[PDB]
Amino acid sequence: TATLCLGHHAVPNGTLVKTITDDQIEVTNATELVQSSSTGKICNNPHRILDGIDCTLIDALLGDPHCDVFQNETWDLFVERSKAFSNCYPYDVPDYASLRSLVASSGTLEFITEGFTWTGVTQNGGSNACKRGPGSGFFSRLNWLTKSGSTYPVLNVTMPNNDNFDKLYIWGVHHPSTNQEQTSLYVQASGRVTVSTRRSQQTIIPNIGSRPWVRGLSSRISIYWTIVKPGDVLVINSNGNLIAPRGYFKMRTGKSSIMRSDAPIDTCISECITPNGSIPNDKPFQNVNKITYGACPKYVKQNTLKLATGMRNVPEK
Amino acid sequence: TATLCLGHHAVPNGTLVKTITDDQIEVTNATELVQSSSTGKICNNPHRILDGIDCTLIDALLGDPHCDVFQNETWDLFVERSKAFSNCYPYDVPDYASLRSLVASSGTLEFITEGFTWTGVTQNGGSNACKRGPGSGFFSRLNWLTKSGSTYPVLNVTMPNNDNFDKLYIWGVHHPSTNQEQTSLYVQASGRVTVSTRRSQQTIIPNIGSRPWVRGLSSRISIYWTIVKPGDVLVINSNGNLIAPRGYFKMRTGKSSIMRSDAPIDTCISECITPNGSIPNDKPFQNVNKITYGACPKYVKQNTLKLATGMRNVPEK
Amino acid sequence: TATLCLGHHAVPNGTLVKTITDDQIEVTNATELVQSSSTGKICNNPHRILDGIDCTLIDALLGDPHCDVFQNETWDLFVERSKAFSNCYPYDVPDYASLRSLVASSGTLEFITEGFTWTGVTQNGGSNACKRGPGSGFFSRLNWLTKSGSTYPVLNVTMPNNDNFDKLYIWGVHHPSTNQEQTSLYVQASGRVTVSTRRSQQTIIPNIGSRPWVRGLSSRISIYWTIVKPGDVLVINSNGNLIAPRGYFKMRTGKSSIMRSDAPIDTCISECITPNGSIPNDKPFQNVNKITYGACPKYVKQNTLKLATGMRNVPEK
Amino acid sequence: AGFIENGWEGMIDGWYGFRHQNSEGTGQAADLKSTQAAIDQINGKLNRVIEKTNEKFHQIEKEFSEVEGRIQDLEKYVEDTKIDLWSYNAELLVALENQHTIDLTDSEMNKLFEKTGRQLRENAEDMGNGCFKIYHKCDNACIESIRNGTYDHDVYRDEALNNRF
Amino acid sequence: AGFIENGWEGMIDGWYGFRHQNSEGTGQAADLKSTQAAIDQINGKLNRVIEKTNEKFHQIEKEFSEVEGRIQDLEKYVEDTKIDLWSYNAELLVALENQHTIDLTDSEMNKLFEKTGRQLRENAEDMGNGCFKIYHKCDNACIESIRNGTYDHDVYRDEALNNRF
Amino acid sequence: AGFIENGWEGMIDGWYGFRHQNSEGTGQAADLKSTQAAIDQINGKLNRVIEKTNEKFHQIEKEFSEVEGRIQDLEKYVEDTKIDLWSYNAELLVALENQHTIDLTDSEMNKLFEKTGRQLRENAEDMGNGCFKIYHKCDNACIESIRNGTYDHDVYRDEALNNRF
Ligand SMILES: *[C@@H]1O[C@H](CO)[C@@H](O)[C@H](O)[C@H]1NC(C)=O
Ligand SMILES: *[C@@H]1O[C@H](CO)[C@@H](O)[C@H](O)[C@H]1NC(C)=O
Ligand SMILES: *[C@@H]1O[C@H](CO)[C@@H](O)[C@H](O)[C@H]1NC(C)=O
Ligand SMILES: *[C@@H]1O[C@H](CO)[C@@H](O)[C@H](O)[C@H]1NC(C)=O
Ligand SMILES: *[C@@H]1O[C@H](CO)[C@@H](O)[C@H](O)[C@H]1NC(C)=O
Ligand SMILES: *[C@@H]1O[C@H](CO)[C@@H](O)[C@H](O)[C@H]1NC(C)=O
Ligand SMILES: *[C@@H]1O[C@H](CO)[C@@H](O)[C@H](O)[C@H]1NC(C)=O
Ligand SMILES: *[C@@H]1O[C@H](CO)[C@@H](O)[C@H](O)[C@H]1NC(C)=O
Ligand SMILES: *[C@@H]1O[C@H](CO)[C@@H](O)[C@H](O)[C@H]1NC(C)=O
Ligand SMILES: *[C@@H]1O[C@H](CO)[C@@H](O)[C@H](O)[C@H]1NC(C)=O
Ligand SMILES: *[C@@H]1O[C@H](CO)[C@@H](O)[C@H](O)[C@H]1NC(C)=O
Ligand SMILES: *[C@@H]1O[C@H](CO)[C@@H](O)[C@H](O)[C@H]1NC(C)=O
């Protein structure tokens, strides 16, 4: 006679996995399905990464003197840093978060200057709170209009959209610290700014008073925006406190976004970006972050998941 | 001896399905779980479908002269068309989308006229921008109040809810194009409209100025609404620019909704409506649209899913 | 020879469960995975439960005379009752729901009085609509400022945050019923209240007019709030209608929340609270409610789910 | 097995069955009990066992004609999240259901085989091709007795064992 | 099998076991190793293997007393979406878990049967009713030897084969 | 089985295979068809069978530096809901996939065993330890014939049955 024995391989040291019927079963091999680490750096390929160094996207949009390098810049991902700071005339943006989202998803700061004509007013006013070069200045994409001589007319300007794309207009309203400023700056006891299209309008009333001092100023500027579609018309009506647009930003649709991260950017390639740096995307899940951009693994709570890649390991003994 | 062979059937041409262990396995039969097509038409049964032909729900609500056919109409589903247009005094609705949602879910335009008494004012003013018949007109559910003789009193009117249901009041505020209109129309340099209940109030200040011309007018009307519950009271206070309610809409709860679609409506029966037309609901999933109404299959990305309805197909060879 | 029979146990009366291949299969034993009932009572352990008896969280925050017992109180869960009512000067809170959420999640009404100095005005005004003791009164955490003698100066007060935590300030704006009240109360034809920080500002304009009568008053107070972070500064500017803060609420982060329930509270222990009372948390699912607090089972639609805890039951016959 | 080597394209009166060869020639018949059992399990599964159609009415807007900011971003996010999760459920469910259909139908075939093998006992051998070699003369009445569960192995052992050994 | 024909309502000392008849009369005993194995798999499954209770605190409002418009519509939508998905997970999970419980307990029964069959080797025949016919005298000590895994088939073949053939 | 008692730490040319002892001494060889079948099923499963990576771009904000009220509460709620559901899917999926891997690899081992048993027919006995006792002289050429599916049991029965009985 003869003996024919059937069997399978085993390994000296296997690994444990979980099944429906068993909490821990040893298997010959298992792989890891959760990516739990990053390189600590953001890769600059294949996506276009724009490091706002000390700028926020809104300061870059408005034209803060330290952000002059971002004029007409584009990105797939705009990266904000914790060290970013503003250094211009103090301002606020009602619904800041929406404007930040609109610009971030458009993906561009391409700006086209338009021939707005403002008559009977002094154009291009600035402040020592926004120095540009050795003297006073202002945001590069805004025009601070003030009285001319002894008057300030009601401004009524029309700017039609005869193009085949949407135009984004950024404008604002000045808020003087006192009654003695508003009548020396734009000779008006009660200003108003109205900006409208064929479908909607926004009217803003300025609010006089001292705020905490920021960069030497107790006054503020509020930022507002409007979108004009092809065939529509932009109309601006004001009797004081207008921080006029100088033109429009071209709007786009696409894959562009924004992230907050202090990670450095390097010469490597990775499709998945998290605020902790780029991660591999060769696993179905990750627990590095919830904030991701690009071709990323799904975020899960688990730090580890082991998937058997082989059979039960039963040692010889 | 004898031979007894056991086996199973096979078919000349089977179909492929996916399993956990196999990417493609041939089976005798398989069914399709994703509904990927529509008839291109909306069925008028069992649901009540209201085709707004050239009307939007809001124009039907306000009383645009082309929408006079929708007075006191009801629906389970209101259908808006891409060809719909407005043709009345130009207007805007702050938070348009919420009003559209409220009315759509109520499911009715039933309107009850109330005995509001407006004294010292001229009632029923109209415009050539909203012609009704051969002459001027206005929205049928609104009352444009203007000066009487040389004055305009402050209007203070009270309308209690002694009923057992909620009342929806639609009202608005006029926005003149100029200082020379507001003092000839309702003799007032600065108008205000305040509408309130025992729980909340809304005060609107009119904004003077020219907007782009729509149907010959540079002026606008803003639409606002309030809901008065049983036991509450409606109070209206104004010193100019009031587009008064003429009564209330009766509010209801239920299955009613709204959809945007250019699909035609026909004499067929289907429980599931999508903007591409009605679809069968005999499959668990569909990929026709994400916008659905009624007893619909779940929307999935997949264009196809095959479910084996039989065993593996192994041909004789 | 001999017979050796192999088999398994059976029970006289088994239970039915559902599987992938069978709609109903009898098994020896099965357990219930859906918790479908409550005790009808809320347990006061391990969580700290604060029964607002006739108070809402906002009345407790503002200082309604019936809620004086909740001063400096804390909770893990604040419980509102359907019988709760207000009994003070009539008020409204724009975005009521957000303020209710902020306070509920902070978990405390700890209040610190600050040395605000209001000069040229009369402090601590009250009303017969908010009686405290036998005479007139007001909300305990607010200061109603009115004219002094024949004047009312513009108030400009600064209160810096030099602490290491966020400060919540509650303040409001008075809305007189008439032009004959606003000039006798705070001698001003047009009041305004501006409250600001280094990052944002709020300016409120009062609205004159009669509202439905509540507790004998046709006038109203609107409630607003602001948060001042460490290093920031609170600035208040007003020329009339200011219901001043008396200090700040200390903000916290944590597990605190709010629930609406008419269930009584008792001396028992339970980690899961629903508005129908506490429930056991020894099952993975529940269908008692969707509103839960603490270590609760997941809410499902199903009233029952049976999980086999044993084998198929096949009776002897 | 013979049911691994192939199926029968010539079997149309059921899903599972028998084919035979004896002194009277050849023949075929479906087994209706295993055919119906496989069918009942499948018809159940193809029905609303773990899922059903839900009826929905008013819902959020899913398409937009304007750029709005935060609320619209959240509405889109919520809808995309819902779709990804239901698309996942559909893939997993179909693959699980198909895995179970293949396994239940292979099992019904193996059950019929074991059922037959124990009826035959020692009077037949498993040839490794889904067939049993019966070691005694077994005419058409005998084959039907095996097919309907009434074969008595005790009246054949004396012949069958002589032919096997 | 006999374990398909029925279970034993008279077996209370375990889940799986043996029943026998010999020259000393009849008897019964549970098999504790297969009983415990089935129990351990089940007790694991009934525990937090793929799910656990999460502790939640402040959340969105889920009930409303007023008609608000878009935000409320989105809040309701989000909650309904969550409920439909968890209700689905509960149906699929329970049906999968029950499918696995039935399959693991049927398998433990079949494992005991095969285990017994190979201990007996050629000294016994499978009668098709979950029973083995043992072809040699097998007294109560013999039956326990089979039950505890110590049966030596080599001391019985000479008798058992004479009785089988 | 012997494949339950243990695996072979000495088998490195495949996953499943044969080990033998005969008159020429001992030896070992992997079975490549069952090894590859188990591998193909696993490599498929480890790939995007029921799931794939989705590419996402602009999304909602998930972290906040300020206390906002209702919108922020809803955004957080939506994200937590998404995470709990995907975390659940990951637990269930991995446990199901691991359950299927163990079951398919145990089944491939049992298939090789049954495949061998029916090639041997009556010329061998199952010893209960994953081994077949072959009752005829079977040299290295014979063992390879069994291993590659060409063993002819009809040329050995006359010897094998004399040794078995
Ligand atoms: C931005 O692009 C426009 C395109 O017409 C061009 O006119 C303008 O000069 C560019 N500005 C900068 C800073 O490059
Ligand atoms: C108002 O208060 C600020 C401090 O925040 C102070 O700097 C400013 O001079 C004050 N202005 C008036 C009107 O007195
Ligand atoms: C990176 O991961 C850590 C957890 O280890 C987390 O605390 C941190 O917030 C993540 N990165 C950022 C900047 O979001
Ligand atoms: C609408 O219904 C009300 C119910 O009282 C009725 O008075 C009114 O005349 C109806 N209007 C139309 C257009 O039918
Ligand atoms: C304001 O501009 C518009 C063009 O949009 C024009 O039609 C209107 O007459 C102008 N009005 C004034 C106040 O000059
Ligand atoms: C109908 O389906 C198509 C995809 O083929 C889609 O583009 C379209 O938007 C759907 N219908 C509507 C009007 O939503
Ligand atoms: C609330 O706590 C503060 C802490 O400084 C204390 O000054 C104040 O008196 C306390 N108030 C009450 C009602 O206990
Ligand atoms: C305004 O109407 C109310 C009723 O809501 C009444 O009590 C009040 O006296 C009226 N006031 C005026 C200004 O006549
Ligand atoms: C308690 O459960 C019932 C359903 O039986 C439900 O109607 C009720 O709303 C729940 N409790 C509360 C107060 O939410
Ligand atoms: C089985 O078939 C045989 C031969 O045709 C017949 O005599 C017997 O009665 C049948 N038994 C049953 C239960 O149908
Ligand atoms: C098995 O049972 C027999 C008879 O009772 C006994 O002699 C033997 O020692 C037992 N063996 C074990 C391992 O329990
Ligand atoms: C199987 O092995 C034998 C012995 O080595 C050899 O003669 C035969 O040709 C092989 N057959 C196949 C199909 O490889």
Numbering used by the authors:
A (entry chain C), B (entry chain A), C (entry chain E): 10 to 326
D (entry chain B), E (entry chain F), F (entry chain D): 7 to 171
Paper quotes:
Therefore, we collected cryo-EM data of both endo H treated HK/68 and Sing/16. Indeed, we observed significant destabilization of Sing/16 but not HK/68 following endo H treatment as seen from the cryo-EM 3-D classification results. By pooling the particles from the well-folded 3-D classes (100% of the HK/68 particles) we obtained 2.3 Å and 3.2 Å-resolution reconstructions of endo H treated HK/68 and Sing/16, respectively. Both structures were nearly identical to their natively glycosylated counterparts in the protein backbone. endo H treatment of HK/68 resulted in a similar uniform distribution of views compared to endo H treated Sing/16. For instance, the glycan at N165, which shows the highest apparent occupancy in both endo H treated cryo-EM maps, is also the most ordered as measured by local map intensity. Cryo-EM reconstructions demonstrated that enzymatic deglycosylation resulted in significant destabilization of the more contemporary H3 HA, Sing/16, whereas the 1968 H3 HA remained structurally intact following glycan removal.
Hemagglutinin (HA), the most abundant glycoprotein on the surface of influenza viruses, serves as the primary antigenic target for neutralizing antibodies. HA is a trimeric glycoprotein with each monomer composed of a globular head containing a vestigial esterase subdomain in its lower portion, and a stem domain17. Each subunit consists of a membrane-distal polypeptide (HA1) and a membrane-proximal polypeptide (HA2).
